[PDB]
Amino acid sequence: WVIVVGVIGVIG
Secondary structure, three states: OOOOOOOOOOOO
């Protein structure tokens, strides 16, 4: 949430 995968704690 929302798009890319990875990036400091972000999930989908």
